[PDB]
Coordinates of C-alpha atoms and ligand atoms in Angstrom, one line a residue:
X3 CA -22.1 16.8 26.6
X4 CA -21.8 14.2 29.7
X5 CA -21.9 11.2 27.4
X6 CA -19.6 10.8 24.5
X7 CA -22.1 7.8 22.8
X8 CA -24.7 10.5 22.4
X9 CA -22.1 13.1 20.5
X10 CA -19.9 10.6 18.4
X11 CA -24.2 8.8 17.2
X12 CA -24.8 12.4 16.1
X13 CA -21.5 13.7 15.0
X14 CA -21.9 10.4 12.7
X15 CA -25.1 9.0 11.5
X16 CA -27.2 6.1 12.8
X17 CA -26.3 3.6 9.5
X18 CA -22.6 4.9 10.1
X19 CA -22.1 4.1 13.8
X20 CA -24.1 0.7 13.0
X21 CA -20.9 0.4 11.2
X22 CA -18.5 1.3 13.0
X23 CA -19.7 -0.8 15.7
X24 CA -20.1 -3.9 13.4
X25 CA -16.6 -3.7 12.2
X26 CA -14.9 -3.2 15.7
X27 CA -16.7 -6.3 17.0
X28 CA -15.1 -8.3 14.4
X29 CA -12.1 -7.2 14.2
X30 CA -11.6 -8.5 17.9
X31 CA -14.5 -11.6 17.3
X32 CA -13.4 -13.2 14.4
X33 CA -15.4 -16.9 15.4
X34 CA -19.2 -14.8 16.2
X35 CA -21.0 -15.3 13.1
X36 CA -22.9 -12.4 11.2
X37 CA -25.9 -13.0 13.1
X38 CA -25.0 -12.4 16.7
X39 CA -22.8 -9.6 15.5
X40 CA -26.7 -7.6 14.4
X41 CA -27.0 -8.8 17.8
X42 CA -24.3 -7.0 19.6
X43 CA -24.6 -4.1 17.0
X44 CA -28.7 -3.2 17.9
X45 CA -27.9 -3.9 21.5
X46 CA -25.2 -0.9 21.0
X47 CA -27.0 1.4 19.0
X48 CA -30.5 1.1 21.2
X49 CA -27.6 1.8 24.2
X50 CA -26.8 4.9 21.9
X51 CA -30.3 5.9 21.8
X52 CA -31.0 6.0 25.4
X53 CA -27.4 8.2 26.0
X54 CA -28.9 10.4 22.8
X55 CA -32.1 10.5 24.9
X56 CA -31.2 10.4 28.8
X57 CA -28.4 12.2 28.8
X58 CA -27.3 10.3 32.2
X59 CA -28.6 7.4 31.8
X60 CA -27.1 3.6 34.0
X61 CA -23.7 3.8 32.1
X62 CA -24.0 6.6 30.2
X63 CA -21.0 9.4 31.0
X64 CA -18.9 6.5 30.3
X65 CA -15.6 6.6 28.3
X66 CA -15.9 4.6 24.3
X67 CA -13.1 2.5 25.6
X68 CA -14.1 1.4 29.0
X69 CA -18.0 0.9 26.8
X70 CA -16.4 -0.9 24.5
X71 CA -14.5 -3.6 26.9
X72 CA -18.0 -4.0 29.2
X73 CA -19.7 -5.0 25.3
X74 CA -16.8 -7.3 24.8
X75 CA -16.8 -8.9 28.2
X76 CA -19.8 -9.5 27.7
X77 CA -20.0 -12.3 24.7
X78 CA -20.3 -15.8 26.6
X79 CA -18.0 -17.9 24.6
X80 CA -14.8 -15.6 25.1
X81 CA -12.4 -18.0 26.2
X82 CA -13.7 -21.1 25.2
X83 CA -12.7 -19.7 21.5
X84 CA -10.5 -16.9 21.0
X85 CA -8.3 -18.3 24.0
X86 CA -5.6 -15.6 26.4
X87 CA -7.9 -12.7 25.4
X88 CA -10.1 -13.9 28.4
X89 CA -7.2 -12.9 30.6
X90 CA -8.1 -9.2 28.6
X91 CA -12.0 -9.5 30.8
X92 CA -10.7 -10.1 33.8
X93 CA -8.4 -6.8 34.3
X94 CA -9.8 -3.3 35.2
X95 CA -9.3 0.3 32.5
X96 CA -6.8 1.4 30.9
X97 CA -5.1 -1.9 30.9
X98 CA -7.9 -4.2 30.0
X99 CA -8.0 -2.4 26.6
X100 CA -3.9 -2.8 26.0
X101 CA -4.8 -6.5 26.9
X102 CA -7.1 -6.7 24.1
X103 CA -5.0 -4.7 21.9
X104 CA -2.1 -7.2 22.4
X105 CA -4.0 -10.9 22.0
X106 CA -5.0 -10.0 18.5
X107 CA -2.7 -12.4 16.4
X108 CA -4.2 -10.9 12.7
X109 CA -3.7 -14.2 10.6
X110 CA -6.5 -16.6 11.9
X111 CA -7.0 -19.1 8.6
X112 CA -10.5 -18.3 7.4
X113 CA -12.6 -20.4 4.7
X114 CA -11.0 -18.9 1.8
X115 CA -13.9 -16.0 0.3
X116 CA -16.9 -18.1 -2.1
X117 CA -17.9 -16.1 -4.8
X118 CA -20.8 -17.3 -6.3
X119 CA -22.7 -16.5 -9.6
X120 CA -23.6 -12.9 -10.6
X121 CA -26.9 -13.3 -10.6
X122 CA -27.6 -14.9 -6.6
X123 CA -25.8 -12.0 -5.6
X124 CA -27.3 -9.8 -7.2
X125 CA -30.4 -10.9 -6.6
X126 CA -29.3 -11.1 -2.9
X127 CA -28.2 -7.9 -3.1
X128 CA -31.7 -6.3 -4.5
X129 CA -34.2 -8.4 -1.6
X130 CA -31.9 -6.4 1.1
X131 CA -28.9 -3.6 0.2
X132 CA -28.8 -3.1 3.9
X133 CA -27.9 -6.2 5.0
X134 CA -25.9 -7.4 2.3
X135 CA -23.3 -4.2 2.5
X136 CA -23.3 -5.9 6.3
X137 CA -22.0 -9.4 5.4
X138 CA -19.6 -7.7 3.2
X139 CA -17.8 -5.7 5.9
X140 CA -18.2 -9.1 8.4
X141 CA -16.4 -11.4 6.1
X142 CA -13.6 -8.5 5.2
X143 CA -13.9 -6.8 9.1
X144 CA -12.3 -10.4 10.7
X145 CA -10.1 -11.0 7.9
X146 CA -8.1 -7.8 8.6
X147 CA -8.4 -7.0 11.8
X148 CA -5.7 -4.5 11.4
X149 CA -7.6 -2.8 8.8
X150 CA -8.9 1.1 9.7
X151 CA -12.0 0.6 10.0
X152 CA -13.8 3.7 8.4
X153 CA -11.0 3.2 5.1
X154 CA -13.1 -0.1 5.1
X155 CA -16.3 1.8 4.9
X156 CA -15.4 3.6 1.5
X157 CA -14.4 0.2 -0.2
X158 CA -18.3 -1.0 1.3
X159 CA -19.4 2.9 -0.8
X160 CA -17.8 1.4 -3.8
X161 CA -19.3 -2.3 -3.3
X162 CA -22.9 -0.7 -3.5
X163 CA -22.1 1.4 -5.9
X164 CA -20.3 -1.3 -8.2
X165 CA -23.4 -3.8 -7.4
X166 CA -26.1 -0.7 -7.8
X167 CA -25.1 -0.2 -11.8
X168 CA -23.7 -3.4 -13.0
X169 CA -26.6 -5.3 -11.6
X170 CA -29.5 -3.8 -13.5
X171 CA -27.5 -3.9 -16.7
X172 CA -27.9 -6.6 -20.0
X173 CA -24.7 -8.5 -19.3
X174 CA -24.1 -8.1 -15.0
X175 CA -21.1 -10.4 -15.8
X176 CA -18.9 -8.1 -18.0
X177 CA -19.2 -4.9 -15.6
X178 CA -19.2 -6.2 -11.8
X179 CA -16.6 -9.1 -12.0
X180 CA -14.3 -6.7 -13.5
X181 CA -15.0 -3.6 -10.8
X182 CA -15.1 -6.6 -8.2
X183 CA -11.3 -7.5 -9.3
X184 CA -10.1 -4.5 -9.2
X185 CA -11.6 -3.6 -5.7
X186 CA -9.9 -7.0 -4.5
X187 CA -6.5 -5.4 -5.5
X188 CA -7.2 -1.6 -4.4
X189 CA -8.1 -3.2 -0.7
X190 CA -4.8 -5.1 -0.5
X191 CA -3.0 -2.7 -2.3
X192 CA -4.5 -0.7 0.4
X193 CA -3.9 -3.1 3.4
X194 CA 0.2 -3.7 2.1
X195 CA 0.7 -0.2 2.6
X196 CA -0.7 0.2 6.3
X197 CA 2.0 -2.8 7.1
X198 CA 5.0 -0.9 5.5
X199 CA 4.3 2.2 6.5
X200 CA 4.0 -0.1 10.4
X201 CA 7.0 -2.3 10.1
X202 CA 9.4 0.8 9.3
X203 CA 8.0 2.9 12.3
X204 CA 8.8 -0.3 14.2
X205 CA 12.3 -0.9 12.8
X206 CA 13.6 3.3 12.1
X207 CA 11.4 5.0 15.2
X208 CA 9.5 8.2 15.2
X209 CA 12.6 10.7 14.3
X210 CA 12.6 8.4 11.1
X211 CA 8.9 8.4 10.4
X212 CA 9.2 12.4 11.0
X213 CA 11.8 13.0 7.9
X214 CA 9.4 10.7 5.5
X215 CA 6.4 12.9 6.7
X216 CA 8.2 16.2 6.7
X217 CA 9.5 15.5 2.9
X218 CA 6.0 14.3 2.3
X219 CA 3.5 17.2 3.4
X220 CA 6.2 19.9 2.4
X221 CA 5.0 18.2 -1.0
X222 CA 1.6 18.5 -0.5
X223 CA 1.6 21.9 1.0
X224 CA 4.5 23.9 -0.6
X225 CA 3.2 27.3 0.9
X226 CA 2.6 26.3 4.5
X227 CA 5.0 27.7 6.6
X228 CA 8.0 24.9 8.0
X229 CA 6.2 25.7 11.3
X230 CA 3.0 25.1 10.4
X231 CA 4.3 21.5 8.8
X232 CA 6.2 20.4 11.8
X233 CA 3.1 20.7 13.6
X234 CA 0.9 18.5 11.1
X235 CA 4.0 15.8 11.0
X236 CA 4.0 15.9 15.1
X237 CA -0.3 15.0 15.4
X238 CA 0.7 12.6 11.9
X239 CA 3.0 11.0 13.9
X240 CA 1.6 10.6 17.2
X241 CA -1.9 9.4 15.0
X242 CA 0.2 7.0 12.6
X243 CA 1.7 5.3 16.2
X244 CA -1.8 4.9 18.1
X245 CA -3.5 3.6 14.5
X246 CA 0.1 0.9 14.4
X247 CA -0.2 -0.3 18.2
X248 CA -4.4 -1.4 16.5
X249 CA -6.5 1.2 18.8
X250 CA -8.6 2.1 16.0
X251 CA -10.5 4.4 19.1
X252 CA -8.0 7.1 19.9
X253 CA -6.9 6.6 15.4
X254 CA -10.3 7.6 14.5
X255 CA -10.2 10.6 17.0
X256 CA -6.9 11.9 16.7
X257 CA -7.3 11.5 12.4
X258 CA -10.7 13.2 13.6
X259 CA -8.8 15.7 15.3
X260 CA -6.2 16.4 12.8
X261 CA -8.6 16.7 9.4
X262 CA -10.9 19.4 11.8
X263 CA -7.2 21.7 12.3
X264 CA -6.1 21.2 8.6
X265 CA -9.9 22.3 7.4
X266 CA -9.8 25.7 10.2
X267 CA -6.9 26.8 8.9
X268 CA -6.3 25.7 4.5
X269 CA -5.6 29.3 3.9
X270 CA -2.9 28.7 5.7
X271 CA -2.1 25.4 4.4
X272 CA -3.3 24.8 0.7
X273 CA -5.7 26.0 -1.5
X274 CA -6.3 22.4 -2.5
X275 CA -8.7 20.7 0.6
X276 CA -11.3 23.3 -0.3
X277 CA -13.7 20.3 -1.4
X278 CA -12.4 17.8 1.1
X279 CA -13.6 20.3 4.2
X280 CA -17.2 20.6 2.2
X281 CA -17.2 16.5 3.6
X282 CA -18.4 15.2 6.7
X283 CA -16.3 14.5 9.5
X284 CA -15.7 10.9 8.6
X285 CA -14.8 11.6 4.9
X286 CA -12.5 14.6 5.8
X287 CA -9.6 11.9 6.9
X288 CA -9.7 10.1 3.5
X289 CA -10.3 13.0 1.4
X290 CA -7.1 15.0 3.1
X291 CA -4.6 11.6 2.5
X292 CA -5.1 12.1 -1.4
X293 CA -5.5 15.4 -1.6
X294 CA -4.0 17.2 -4.7
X295 CA -0.5 18.9 -4.1
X296 CA -1.0 22.6 -3.8
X297 CA 1.2 25.2 -6.3
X298 CA 4.6 26.0 -5.3
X299 CA 5.1 30.3 -4.7
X300 CA 6.6 31.8 -7.7
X301 CA 8.8 33.8 -5.7
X302 CA 10.5 31.5 -3.2
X303 CA 14.2 32.1 -2.1
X304 CA 17.0 29.6 -4.3
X305 CA 17.5 26.9 -1.5
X306 CA 21.2 27.0 -2.1
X307 CA 21.5 30.5 -0.3
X308 CA 20.8 29.3 3.1
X309 CA 22.6 25.9 2.6
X310 CA 25.6 26.3 0.7
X311 CA 26.3 30.0 -0.3
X312 CA 26.3 31.0 3.4
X313 CA 28.8 31.2 5.9
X314 CA 26.3 30.2 9.0
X315 CA 25.2 26.7 7.9
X316 CA 27.6 25.8 10.3
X317 CA 26.8 28.4 13.3
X318 CA 23.0 27.7 12.0
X319 CA 23.3 23.7 12.3
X320 CA 24.8 23.9 16.2
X321 CA 21.6 25.4 17.2
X322 CA 19.8 23.0 16.4
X323 CA 20.4 20.2 14.0
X324 CA 17.4 18.3 13.3
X325 CA 14.9 21.3 13.2
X326 CA 18.0 22.7 10.7
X327 CA 18.0 19.2 9.0
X328 CA 14.1 19.6 8.9
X329 CA 14.1 23.0 7.3
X330 CA 16.6 21.8 4.0
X331 CA 13.9 18.8 3.4
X332 CA 10.7 21.1 4.5
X333 CA 12.8 23.7 1.6
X334 CA 13.7 20.7 -1.0
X335 CA 10.6 18.3 -0.6
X336 CA 8.1 21.8 -1.6
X337 CA 10.7 22.5 -4.4
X338 CA 11.0 19.2 -6.2
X339 CA 6.9 17.5 -6.2
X340 CA 8.4 15.8 -9.2
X341 CA 10.8 14.1 -6.8
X342 CA 9.9 10.1 -5.1
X343 CA 10.2 10.7 -1.0
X344 CA 12.9 8.4 -0.6
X345 CA 15.3 10.2 -3.2
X346 CA 14.9 14.0 -0.7
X347 CA 15.8 11.3 1.7
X348 CA 18.5 10.2 0.5
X349 CA 19.8 14.1 -0.7
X350 CA 18.6 14.8 3.4
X351 CA 21.0 11.9 4.0
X352 CA 24.0 13.3 2.4
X353 CA 23.6 16.4 3.6
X354 CA 23.5 16.0 7.3
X355 CA 26.6 13.1 6.8
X356 CA 28.7 16.3 4.9
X357 CA 27.4 18.4 7.2
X358 CA 29.1 16.4 10.4
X359 CA 32.4 16.4 8.8
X360 CA 32.8 19.5 7.0
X361 CA 31.6 21.5 10.4
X362 CA 34.0 19.8 12.3
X363 CA 37.0 20.4 9.7
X364 CA 39.6 22.9 8.9
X365 CA 37.8 25.1 6.7
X366 CA 33.8 24.9 6.3
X367 CA 33.1 26.5 3.5
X368 CA 35.9 25.2 1.6
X369 CA 34.5 21.3 2.3
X370 CA 30.5 21.9 1.6
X371 CA 31.0 24.0 -1.5
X372 CA 30.3 21.5 -3.5
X373 CA 27.7 19.3 -1.9
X374 CA 24.7 20.0 -4.6
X375 CA 27.4 18.1 -7.1
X376 CA 27.0 15.0 -4.8
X377 CA 22.5 15.6 -5.4
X378 CA 23.1 14.9 -9.5
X379 CA 24.0 11.4 -9.5
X380 CA 21.6 10.6 -7.3
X381 CA 19.2 12.5 -8.7
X382 CA 19.9 11.2 -12.4
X383 CA 20.1 7.5 -11.2
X384 CA 16.1 7.3 -11.0
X385 CA 15.3 9.7 -13.4
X386 CA 17.3 7.8 -16.6
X387 CA 15.7 4.3 -15.2
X388 CA 11.7 5.6 -15.7
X389 CA 13.4 7.4 -19.2
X390 CA 14.8 4.2 -20.1
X391 CA 12.2 1.9 -19.0
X392 CA 9.6 3.6 -19.8
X393 CA 10.6 4.9 -23.4
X394 CA 11.0 0.5 -23.3
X395 CA 7.5 0.3 -22.4
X396 CA 6.4 2.3 -25.3
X397 CA 8.1 0.1 -27.3
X398 CA 6.4 -3.0 -26.4
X399 CA 3.2 -3.8 -25.2
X400 CA 2.0 -4.0 -21.7
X401 CA 2.1 -7.3 -21.9
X402 CA 5.6 -7.5 -24.3
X403 CA 7.0 -5.6 -21.6
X404 CA 6.8 -8.2 -18.6
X405 CA 8.7 -10.5 -20.8
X406 CA 11.4 -7.7 -21.2
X407 CA 11.4 -7.8 -16.9
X408 CA 10.9 -11.5 -17.0
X409 CA 14.1 -12.6 -18.7
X410 CA 16.0 -9.3 -16.5
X411 CA 15.2 -10.4 -13.4
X412 CA 15.3 -14.5 -14.0
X413 CA 18.7 -13.8 -15.5
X414 CA 19.5 -11.4 -12.0
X415 CA 17.9 -14.3 -9.6
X416 CA 17.5 -17.4 -11.0
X417 CA 16.6 -19.5 -7.8
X418 CA 14.0 -17.2 -7.0
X419 CA 10.3 -19.3 -7.5
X420 CA 9.2 -19.1 -11.0
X421 CA 5.6 -17.9 -9.3
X422 CA 7.4 -14.9 -7.4
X423 CA 8.9 -14.4 -11.1
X424 CA 5.9 -14.1 -12.4
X425 CA 3.8 -12.3 -9.5
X426 CA 6.3 -9.6 -9.6
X427 CA 7.2 -9.0 -12.9
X428 CA 3.4 -8.5 -14.4
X429 CA 3.1 -6.2 -11.6
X430 CA 6.1 -4.7 -12.7
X431 CA 5.0 -3.9 -15.7
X432 CA 1.2 -2.4 -14.7
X433 CA 3.1 0.3 -12.9
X434 CA 4.9 1.1 -16.4
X435 CA 1.3 1.4 -18.3
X436 CA 0.3 3.2 -15.2
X437 CA 3.0 5.7 -14.5
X438 CA 4.6 6.6 -17.9
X439 CA 1.1 7.7 -18.8
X440 CA 2.1 10.8 -17.2
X441 CA 5.1 13.5 -17.8
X442 CA 8.6 13.6 -16.2
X443 CA 7.4 16.0 -13.5
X444 CA 4.5 12.8 -11.7
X445 CA 6.0 9.9 -12.7
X446 CA 8.8 9.1 -10.3
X447 CA 6.6 9.6 -7.4
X448 CA 3.7 7.2 -9.1
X449 CA 6.3 4.7 -9.4
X450 CA 8.0 5.8 -6.0
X451 CA 3.9 4.8 -4.8
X452 CA 3.7 1.4 -6.3
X453 CA 7.4 -0.3 -6.4
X454 CA 7.3 0.4 -2.2
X455 CA 4.4 -2.0 -1.8
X456 CA 5.7 -4.4 -5.0
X457 CA 9.2 -4.7 -3.6
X458 CA 7.8 -5.3 -0.1
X459 CA 5.7 -8.7 -1.6
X460 CA 8.6 -10.1 -2.9
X461 CA 10.6 -9.1 0.8
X462 CA 7.9 -11.2 2.6
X463 CA 7.3 -13.5 -0.3
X464 CA 11.5 -14.3 0.1
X465 CA 11.4 -14.0 3.9
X466 CA 9.3 -17.3 3.9
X467 CA 11.1 -18.8 1.4
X468 CA 15.1 -17.3 1.3
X469 CA 17.0 -18.2 -1.2
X470 CA 19.8 -15.3 -2.5
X471 CA 21.4 -13.6 0.4
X472 CA 21.6 -10.5 -2.9
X473 CA 17.9 -11.1 -1.9
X474 CA 18.2 -11.2 1.5
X475 CA 20.2 -7.7 1.8
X476 CA 18.5 -5.3 -0.1
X477 CA 15.3 -6.3 1.6
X478 CA 17.0 -5.8 5.4
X479 CA 19.0 -2.9 4.3
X480 CA 17.7 0.7 4.6
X481 CA 14.6 1.5 3.4
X482 CA 15.5 4.1 1.5
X483 CA 18.4 1.9 -0.4
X484 CA 15.8 -0.9 -1.4
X485 CA 15.1 0.3 -4.6
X486 CA 18.6 1.0 -5.7
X487 CA 19.8 -2.3 -4.6
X488 CA 17.4 -4.2 -6.3
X489 CA 18.3 -2.2 -9.5
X490 CA 21.9 -2.7 -8.4
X491 CA 22.1 -6.7 -9.1
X492 CA 23.8 -7.9 -11.4
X493 CA 23.4 -11.6 -13.4
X494 CA 24.4 -14.5 -11.5
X495 CA 27.3 -15.8 -13.3
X496 CA 27.8 -18.8 -10.6
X497 CA 24.4 -20.1 -12.0
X498 CA 24.3 -23.7 -13.3
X499 CA 21.2 -23.8 -15.9
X500 CA 18.1 -26.1 -14.4
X501 CA 17.8 -29.5 -16.8
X502 CA 15.7 -29.6 -19.8
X503 CA 12.3 -31.4 -18.0
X504 CA 9.1 -32.4 -20.7
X505 CA 6.8 -31.8 -18.2
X506 CA 7.3 -28.3 -18.3
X507 CA 7.3 -27.3 -21.6
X508 CA 4.2 -29.2 -23.0
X509 CA 1.0 -27.4 -23.8
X510 CA -2.5 -29.1 -24.6
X511 CA -5.8 -28.0 -26.2
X512 CA -6.6 -27.0 -22.7
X513 CA -5.1 -23.6 -23.0
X514 CA -7.5 -22.8 -25.7
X515 CA -10.2 -21.7 -22.9
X516 CA -8.3 -19.8 -21.1
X517 CA -8.7 -15.9 -20.1
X518 CA -6.6 -14.0 -21.4
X519 CA -4.6 -13.6 -17.6
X520 CA -5.0 -17.8 -17.3
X521 CA -3.3 -17.5 -21.3
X522 CA -0.5 -14.8 -20.4
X523 CA 0.5 -16.4 -17.2
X524 CA 0.6 -20.0 -18.5
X525 CA 2.9 -19.0 -21.0
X526 CA 5.5 -16.3 -18.7
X527 CA 5.9 -19.3 -16.6
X528 CA 7.2 -20.7 -19.5
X529 CA 9.0 -18.0 -20.3
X530 CA 10.7 -18.0 -17.0
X531 CA 10.9 -21.4 -16.8
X532 CA 13.3 -20.7 -20.4
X533 CA 15.5 -18.6 -18.9
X534 CA 15.8 -20.8 -16.0
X535 CA 17.0 -23.8 -18.4
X536 CA 18.6 -21.5 -20.9
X537 CA 20.0 -18.1 -18.7
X538 CA 22.8 -16.6 -21.5
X539 CA 20.6 -17.3 -24.6
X540 CA 20.7 -13.4 -26.2
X541 CA 17.4 -11.8 -25.8
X542 CA 17.4 -12.2 -29.8
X543 CA 16.6 -15.9 -28.7
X544 CA 14.1 -15.8 -26.8
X545 CA 12.5 -13.3 -28.6
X546 CA 12.8 -16.0 -31.8
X547 CA 11.3 -18.6 -29.5
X548 CA 8.9 -16.4 -28.0
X549 CA 7.4 -15.4 -31.3
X550 CA 7.4 -19.3 -32.8
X551 CA 5.8 -20.1 -29.9
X552 CA 3.2 -17.1 -29.9
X553 CA 2.5 -17.9 -33.8
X554 CA 2.4 -21.9 -32.3
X555 CA -0.7 -21.2 -29.9
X556 CA -2.3 -18.5 -31.8
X557 CA -2.3 -21.0 -35.4
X558 CA -4.0 -24.4 -33.4
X559 CA -6.1 -22.7 -31.4
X560 CA -9.4 -22.5 -33.1
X561 CA -8.6 -24.9 -35.9
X562 CA -9.4 -28.5 -37.2
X563 CA -8.0 -30.6 -34.2
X564 CA -5.9 -29.1 -31.8
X565 CA -5.0 -31.1 -29.0
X566 CA -2.2 -33.3 -32.1
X567 CA -1.5 -29.9 -33.7
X568 CA 0.1 -28.5 -29.7
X569 CA 1.1 -32.5 -29.6
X570 CA 3.1 -33.1 -33.0
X571 CA 4.1 -29.6 -34.3
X572 CA 4.7 -28.5 -30.6
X573 CA 7.3 -31.2 -30.4
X574 CA 9.3 -29.7 -33.6
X575 CA 9.5 -26.5 -32.2
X576 CA 11.5 -27.9 -29.1
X577 CA 13.7 -29.5 -31.2
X578 CA 14.0 -26.3 -33.3
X579 CA 15.0 -24.1 -30.2
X580 CA 16.9 -27.3 -28.9
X581 CA 19.1 -26.6 -31.9
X582 CA 19.9 -22.9 -31.9
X583 CA 20.7 -23.1 -27.6
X584 CA 22.9 -26.0 -28.1
Ligands
YT3_14 Y1 -34.0 -3.5 -2.5
YT3_15 Y1 -3.0 5.2 23.7

């Protein structure tokens, strides 16, 4: 209509409109208290009601960017609080929005999240459900300025459901706390993925993202014609570029436009969009993004015919290299949803390389004949790693598998800080228990998802604390070969053992009153420091000390005087270990 505010309000819903407006303003004004934002939201809401009533009231036909900016400049203490952001309020559209976007340093140290007792929150929730979820969004929004506001709304919907059920049950802490921790982990995991996707765009460029998207969309929509997948990738690239740039308004519009188009052509894209295209406008974008892979046509031509066996390959390559390479990805990706996107890019990379030499050669059809024998090792490598690692995950527990990784990676890079080694290994153990549950046809894509974000946190951690040139090489190299680089890491033979530190290997009765997580991390920290001090001790000898130490703790914890038991007999264990490890 004449006004956009009216449409959006009516196209979305008052309560959802009031939420997005709250997040939108909270992401910029990361200082102004909660009560201030509520006033900002109400003023905007009432204004939108005026726009809903009169389709041409005072400043009602203005664009969202314009209207948003005007209200953002209305704040009194703007240059007196945020600093350079106020110079943007002296500009005009569309440069003013571009300004605001620039001055958005997403690292303003804020008071750490203060989680009270389980009953005070439940009481506050019940008294005012609406405002309890409003304060949730505010506190999160200002802490994650680049977090996609709609995605934060699905995190608030789960937050309500958790509190709605767990505040009614007998043991509220044995329902809520675990559910709250899971969300907090899911939230940081979602955040990390967005910032990784964006960092990759600002490193390898649009063409690189396009290649990633083709491979992924072809896996999800293995029926959709190539011309359709290309058009979806072209829209996804523009959507991803405006979201990484920091424009929530254009990001949310382009996502809505794409969600609408996908839902209007589902018969020509996928049959698995039936229930996603049932939902409201805002949930369409989210549902479609996590949509299950469609079944692949059984009557598919052999992909080796049009790319190797054919004698028009070089001729069909010359016409449009990227189009032809895109078709190769499309055909390979849709035939192999059990492959990681990263593996398919290794194959797509290899094929390009081989066509860039063999097509300029004397006899091409002779040169690139055996190109599919070059993929076999590229495919077998990850498959062999998964099968070998998932087998070992069955043999031991989850915690016992983490101990195996602890030893494995400490021996490889013993210079890395214990906490980084513990955090990485524990996370990597949880990948095993969340992927090995599936069969071979789901494991690799499952692994890729989790490994991508686990390997990036390590790379970010190591960049703040540079320690190994090898780890720097792995983090700075091609994103495709990131995981292979870490896999290829050899045991450090140069490394000289850390000297024995009594403080490091002294435990008390205090450990008995630690949660399973706390206890495990204390024990796993001690294991890393054992390998850093005995890096050439065998899996045999480590297992011996670990078990001797495991039996040691589960022998005085809940025993007649546990304070002396863990000090007196604890010293004997150290001495008993110091006899077998020189
Ligand atoms: Y209530
Ligand atoms: Y734009």
